[PDB]
Design a protein around this nucleic acid. Sequence first.
RNA 1: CCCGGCGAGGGGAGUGAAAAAGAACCUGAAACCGUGUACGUACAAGCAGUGGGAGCACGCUUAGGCGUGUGACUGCGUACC
RNA 2: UGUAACGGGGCUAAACCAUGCACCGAAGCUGCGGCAGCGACGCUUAUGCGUUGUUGGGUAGGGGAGCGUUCUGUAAGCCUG
Lengths: 47, 103, 110, 142, 117, 56
Amino acid sequence: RLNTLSPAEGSKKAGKRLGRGIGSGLGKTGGRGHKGQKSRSGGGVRR
Amino acid sequence: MYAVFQSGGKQHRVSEGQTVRLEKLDIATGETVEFAEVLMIANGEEVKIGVPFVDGGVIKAEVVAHGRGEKVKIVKFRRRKHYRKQQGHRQWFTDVKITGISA
Amino acid sequence: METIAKHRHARSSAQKVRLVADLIRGKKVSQALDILTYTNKKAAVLVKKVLESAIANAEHNDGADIDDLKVTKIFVDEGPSMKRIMPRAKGRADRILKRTSHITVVVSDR
Amino acid sequence: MKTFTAKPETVKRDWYVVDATGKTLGRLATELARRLRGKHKAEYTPHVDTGDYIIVLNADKVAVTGNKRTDKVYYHHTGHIGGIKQATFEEMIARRPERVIEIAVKGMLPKGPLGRAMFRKLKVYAGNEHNHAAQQPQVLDI
Amino acid sequence: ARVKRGVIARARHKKILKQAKGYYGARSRVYRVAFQAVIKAGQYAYRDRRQRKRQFRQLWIARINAAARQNGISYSKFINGLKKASVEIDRKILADIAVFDKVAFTALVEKAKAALA
Amino acid sequence: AVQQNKPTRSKRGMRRSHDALTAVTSLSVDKTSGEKHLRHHITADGYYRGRKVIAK
RNA sequence: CCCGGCGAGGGGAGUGAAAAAGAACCUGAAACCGUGUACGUACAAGCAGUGGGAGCACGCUUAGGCGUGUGACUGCGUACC
RNA sequence: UGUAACGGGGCUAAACCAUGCACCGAAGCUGCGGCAGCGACGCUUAUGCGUUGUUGGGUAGGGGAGCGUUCUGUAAGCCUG
């Protein structure tokens, strides 16, 4: 419902959302840089 | 009859009853306009004065067009840099029509 | 005032017909359908059948007088097409388009 | 600002002719250029010409001073593949006298389509051939 | 869930295609060149606002040079004499008396010929 | 071979405008009846240019 | 009932709030060409646009002095990922 | 391959060398309209006004913060033949 209640702010980051273009910070590599398994599937290196 | 007057950095020539472009009036359409900033006046001989403005000289006018023009968009980009920039602009206009020239 | 005649789904593409339907435009009420007494190709018969309907059926379908009757519009458009395939070795497909047209004629008392 | 428009009610053509008889080709070209461009008068001129109409009537009697009369040559690529012709002033004016004025003045005019819109209004004659006799040209002597 | 993209991707096409029509061929509606009729057109409009600020400035110089040369002096020397004479100048757009009042402009070039030593 | 999109109607009509050269000659009246006929061709009465050609 | 080959497919009267609601029947935009009409288009070399504009057409309006649509022609101009 | 080793003309000075004063010369300098940030000086603490000073093209990556879209709740409401 919420409606008549005052909301709370600054207690969630807003958020996991990924960059859509470099005018908003990050673009075509999403902050992981270019190529290698380190850019596709986790940290890209074993134990 | 014609006159020449000052407004800041720019100097304007105008004739009796004529319309002329001015810089934006803050009072819009709501008041009449007058100038004592007149620095040359002629009706049959085009005499120049070197002294600062005509003593007791007056130009009177009415506002005939005022407002903020059509909205436009212009854009900036760079070759293979994958961003896009956009500026909005409108600009203000003001035109005034002479009602008197007095000396 | 106005009378309409049509023929839909005709066995011709519209460009076979339109050459003649464009030629007969801009002619006097003494020359219209009198320039179409002797005709060239099936293309011209498809117009003749519909024009001889419009310029004569208004005598029952609009009013008793047709003795100053004029053609206001005389045009043709390409209708729905039917897709068909033909034999080629190591098939693979090879098609043709079986075309149709829609003929329109309009006449007016003014 | 805007206060003038070139059209036949504001720019009347009145027809002038430069006397070429014994005139120096270069001094004649510096006059013909500015008078085909419209530049001798109080005018306003955009990407157009504000002319008066000007022609040449006795071109086969034009002169060159000192040397370059029988020395140096003018070149043209004929348009028949790599074909080229060359002639000196006193042996070129003997054959093609109306070309001598064209090749002398064309480089004193603007480039491209504006330079072409000026050049299309120029006609050159030899033997005193009076072919604008109804336009009654006013003579200029330099 | 599926993105219908009518309010977004298609709107981002229409925002450009709206500025089409009125052209001498394909750019009136062919999207992949009607885009160039906004983007390349804007690089031409920046050049219009630059050239009407750089190259049309010469109309305040070259027109006045020819008129001063009828009095036998060139612009580069005429202006230095008119600086030495004091007053009657502010902005180069105000010099069109070289066409509108050639008698009073002649006296102003002659003033520079009485101050250039 | 190459052809970009579609031929312009401004050039296609300019190539149709000499393709058949179809003209109006209003036809000539028959030499035995009050009605018009096709040049050097038989009439509906089986006649041509003042003489009988076929039986009815 | 009118037209034609007792066609093909329309139309007139008529059913209906609707027949762009007709069995080929919800509402309906695009590519593609099509009917009318206004201005434009007749020698002139490259991303067909950007700016300027003679001429023409449309609608108001006249003490300090029209705008719109359309536009020969010309200054400027080698796309996108 | 054809104007073709100033791009080309003009030019026996209009070339070559250096000299003296002028002028033309960016999106910047500089003036103004507007905005965000940093900080003073004058007046005042809805919190602003006045003036002066100053920074603002930013990609791999590191931080800050809006507008739409859809579902769920509001919705026993609000708009609607």
